[PDB]
């Protein structure tokens, strides 16, 4: 019974998806996020060996001791919603607010964060899950441990090697082949979203707001960014999907070398 096992606290956020609350598991005081998804807004459904939101299927597939992805601890069905119990880092800030408040991140910080996102996305792909909404809003920073967690699998799909013709993630992080043709492959589209994210980190906002900018193929840098970092970004943002790097190519890129450990990242950049 849901209402017995968790103490609900303050609303943490809401939007199209539904609403999420701070909570604590009564059983042992573990911090949790309690996410309410309305059935009316669930577009994609999966099957547990039960009919659940695809989000629940994807979350279960990526569920593990690896911290890089949010863990689903439990879930419940109600008449008009599903309630998902997610583990909650404490203290936490999402990467959107962190960039808003701090501005453009030092490259050493951006490198540590971006590497950790790469590792988390690799984890998803290797678990057969495509996220489809990689953005700063969907990344939490454990501000004490300096560990990042990918959240929000509500636009995700099972990973496949053929084209996707559906998309409900964030348009400004979506690739030019989606804008032009309503078609993309999963991995190359993920790399584009990663390019947007890296630019966001080192410049303090995303490069593109408009469809014409997304398809235009020009990346103007508004901050001083190293040549090596600009190169990586522009490679991730190649207009031709097959010109974009693999995850291996990204992590082998010279700009990605000598990454900080998460605990060093907290010590140098987060503890204040």
């Amino acid at each position: 019974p849901l209402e017995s096992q968790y103490q609900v606290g303050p609303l943490l956020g809401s939007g199209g998806f539904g609403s999420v609350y701070s909570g604590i598991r009564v059983s042992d005081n573990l911090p949790v996020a309690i996410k309410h998804v309305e059935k009316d807004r669930i577009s994609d459904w999966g099957e547990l060996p039960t009919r659940v939101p695809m989000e629940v299927v994807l979350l279960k597939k990526v569920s593990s001791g690896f911290s890089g992805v949010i863990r689903l601890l439990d879930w419940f069905e109600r008449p008009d919603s599903f309630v998902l119990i997610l583990e909650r880092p404490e203290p936490v800030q999402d990467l959107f607010d962190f960039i808003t408040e701090r501005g453009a991140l030092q490259e050493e910080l951006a490198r540590s964060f971006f590497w950790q996102v790469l590792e988390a996305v690799r984890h998803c792909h290797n678990c057969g899950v495509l996220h489809r909404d990689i953005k700063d809003e969907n990344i939490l920073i454990d501000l004490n441990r300096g560990e990042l967690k990918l959240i929000d699998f509500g636009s995700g799909a099972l990973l496949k090697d053929t084209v996707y013709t559906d998309f409900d993630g964030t348009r400004v992080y979506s690739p030019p082949e989606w804008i032009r043709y309503h078609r993309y492959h999963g991995r190359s589209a993920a790399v584009w979203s990663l390019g947007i994210l890296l630019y966001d980190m080192v410049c303090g906002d995303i490069p593109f707001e408009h469809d014409e900018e997304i398809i235009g193929g020009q990346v103007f840098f508004r901050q001083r960014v190293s040549s090596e970092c600009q190169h990586l970004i522009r490679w991730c943002l190649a207009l031709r999907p097959s010109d974009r790097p693999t995850f291996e190519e990204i992590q082998n890129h010279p700009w990605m070398q000598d990454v900080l450990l998460p605990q060093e990242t907290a010590e140098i950049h987060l503890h204040s």
């Binding site: 939007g15 964030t170 303090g204």
Partner: peptide, 10 residues
Amino acid sequence: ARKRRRHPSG
């Protein structure tokens, strides 16, 4: 001066 905004996932 330039406005940074969240963007809706849909």
